[PDB]
C-alpha cells in the first residue's frame, strides 16, 4: 500500500499557520518560519505568565507607596505596621483602596501608625 | 455465537513495532546510534577486538580428536523401567521405544540409576554392572544382543 503524505502534513501545517495570524512578513505566510516563530512565542508566553505576577505586584507596590507618602508614611513602615496590626489585606486590594477609596486607605494608614512601635530604630 | 469479528489475540500477544527515525518524540535523528563512529554507520564484527589478539586466537585449541568410529548408546536407567513397567515382563528394545524411553533406531544401554523392584527380563545392547545386579536381584534376567 503506497501512502500519500498530503492529508497528514496539511493538518499540522494548517494548525500552525492559523496560530500565526497577525505576524509580520514571512512569519505569517510560510509554515517553516511560522513554526520557528511559534516556538519562540510559546516560550515567551510561558515565561511571561510567570513574570506577570511579579509585574503586577510591582505596580501595586508603586501605587501603595505613592498613596502612603501622600499620608506622610513610607511603604515599608506602612507594611510593617499593617502586619503588626494583624490586617490581612493584600497589595492588590491595598492598591485598589488607594485608587478608589482614599478615605479607607487613610484609615488603614492610621491603624498602621498606631500599631507601629514608638522607636522603630530601637533594638526591639 | 462466535463470529469472525469476535476473534482477538490474547492479552500481551501482540506488540507494536518500534519505528525509528520518525521525529524527536520517539527515536529521532539517530535511531539510537549516538553520534558518529564505526558503529553509527554499519557494524562491528563479533570476532573483532580492536587489533588486540582476540580471545578466540590467544587461547590454545582444546586437546584431542573426535574418533569418527565412536559408538554411542542411548541410555535408560532401571528407575525408568520401574516407573514404566509396573507389571514387569519381557522388555525389549522396541518396548522401550514404544514407552518413549529411547529413540527408535539406536543402540540401547541400560544403566542403574533408579530402584528396580519388579521382576523384569531385559534385552539390550549393553549393561552396566549395577544395572545387571539390579535386574538379577529382582529375579529378572539381563540378556544382551
Amino acid at each position: 500500500a503506497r501512502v500519500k503524505r498530503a492529508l497528514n502534513a496539511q493538518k499540522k501545517r494548517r494548525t500552525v499557520l492559523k496560530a500565526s495570524k497577525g505576524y509580520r512578513g514571512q512569519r505569517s505566510r510560510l509554515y517553516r518560519k511560522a513554526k520557528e516563530q511559534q516556538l519562540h512565542s510559546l516560550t515567551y508566553a510561558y515565561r511571561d505568565r510567570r513574570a506577570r505576577k511579579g509585574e503586577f505586584r510591582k505596580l501595586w507596590i508603586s501605587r501603595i507607596n505613592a498613596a502612603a507618602r501622600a499620608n506622610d508614611i513610607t511603604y515599608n513602615r506602612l507594611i510593617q505596621g499593617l502586619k503588626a496590626a494583624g490586617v490581612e489585606v493584600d497589595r492588590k486590594n491595598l492598591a485598589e483602596l488607594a485608587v478608589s477609596d482614599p478615605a479607607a486607605f487613610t484609615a488603614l494608614v492610621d491603624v498602621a501608625r498606631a500599631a507601629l512601635p514608638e522607636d522603630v530604630n530601637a533594638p526591639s | 455465537v462466535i463470529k469472525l469479528h469476535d476473534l482477538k489475540p490474547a492479552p500481551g500477544e501482540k506488540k507494536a513495532k518500534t519505528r525509528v527515525g520518525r521525529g524527536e518524540g520517539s527515536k529521532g535523528k539517530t535511531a539510537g546510534r549516538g553520534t558518529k563512529g564505526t558503529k553509527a554507520r554499519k557494524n562491528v564484527p563479533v570476532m573483532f577486538e580492536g587489533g588486540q589478539m582476540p580471545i578466540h586466537m590467544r587461547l590454545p585449541k582444546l586437546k584431542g580428536f573426535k574418533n569418527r568410529f565412536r559408538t554411542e548408546y542411548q541410555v535408560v536407567n532401571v528407575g525408568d523401567i520401574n516407573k514404566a513397567f509396573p507389571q514387569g515382563g519381557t522388555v525389549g528394545v522396541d518396548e522401550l521405544v514404544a514407552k518413549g524411553l529411547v529413540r527408535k533406531n539406536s543402540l540401547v544401554k541400560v544403566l542403574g540409576d533408579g530402584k528396580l523392584t519388579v521382576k523384569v527380563d531385559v534385552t539390550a545392547n549393553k549393561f552396566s554392572g549395577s544395572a545387571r545386579e539390579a535386574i538379577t536381584a529382582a529375579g529378572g534376567s539381563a540378556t544382551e544382543l
Binding site: - | 563479533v46 570476532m47 580471545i55 578466540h56 586466537m57 590467544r58 587461547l59 590454545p60 585449541k61 582444546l62 586437546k63
Partner: protein
C-alpha cells in the same frame, strides 16, 4: 541462509553438562624450562570462561 559457526572458537571452547563454557589456559606450549612445576600445575586443566567474555564466546559458538 543458515548461520555459520566460528571455527577457531569451536576448536577452543567447550560446554559442560549444565551449559558452562570451559576453556584451556595459555602459557603451556613451550619455554617450560624456567617455569616452576607449581606454575605449570596452576596452568593445567580447564577453567570456566570469565563473565566478561561469556557473551562474546556464546555468540561466536552459537553462530
Amino acid at each position: 541462509p543458515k548461520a555459520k559457526t566460528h571455527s577457531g572458537a569451536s576448536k577452543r571452547f567447550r560446554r559442560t553438562g549444565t551449559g558452562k563454557i570451559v576453556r584451556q589456559k595459555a602459557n603451556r606450549r613451550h619455554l617450560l624450562e624456567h617455569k616452576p612445576t607449581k606454575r605449570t600445575r596452576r596452568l593445567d586443566g580447564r577453567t570456566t570462561v570469565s563473565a566478561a567474555d561469556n557473551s562474546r564466546i556464546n555468540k561466536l559458538l552459537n553462530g
